[PDB]
Amino acid sequence: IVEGQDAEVGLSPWQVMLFRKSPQELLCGASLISDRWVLTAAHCLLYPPWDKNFTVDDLLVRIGKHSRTRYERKVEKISMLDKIYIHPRYNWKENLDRDIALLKLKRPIELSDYIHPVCLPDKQTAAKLLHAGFKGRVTGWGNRRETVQPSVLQVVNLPLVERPVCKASTRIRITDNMFCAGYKPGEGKRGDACEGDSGGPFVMKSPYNNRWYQMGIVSWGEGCDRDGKYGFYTHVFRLKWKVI
């Protein structure tokens, strides 16, 4: 999370962190969307370009944490997956299209004041909210900048950007299953998720019902806080895939 800020305790209840079990290793971010379903990006589990094909037995999840190292004893809740679901039409050799995966936990996590499900968007909310200029929120423990491992969960609010602008800033084929956000060269403000932040949530707060809806999943990008480049996120709504 480049240019982020230390998250207040309990800021993102849905925050989940993907870990390679042995050796311990923070692989990616992810979000809790029910007491037994986690939402994350496919490339955190399957990305042949860097020979990566994770099974359930190779993954383990930790929920309710704050620091990236220490164990949150009266707060944290470690749980193992029981099955993985990667979108059938996920495009890894081209433009990371449909970069989405569901992780079914083995034992339903028990909610607390530090662990609570994020809401999936509905047409109304998705329609009234997904508008250029409106800033969403990204959280994560990724690189403090590009080659960097944050102590406390970082947070940063980012403004959504117009599709044309997004498409123009990259040779890569942008598809309707992804949007992009970040400040423009000149607004005099910075920030951006970064590798490692991957699989994390890009959420937006609805003033109708005062609740947090998840709008995108940190997917790809070129660099981290590069000028004139914006991060892309899987478009959760266009993907609301049925597996549950």
Binding site: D113, K135, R211
Partner: peptide, 24 residues
Amino acid sequence: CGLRPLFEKKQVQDQTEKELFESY
């Protein structure tokens, strides 16, 4: 869902929330 127990529930705003509505 989406009603964080230590903020929404307690009826309290977090540091950066202002920005969100402000940008709206």
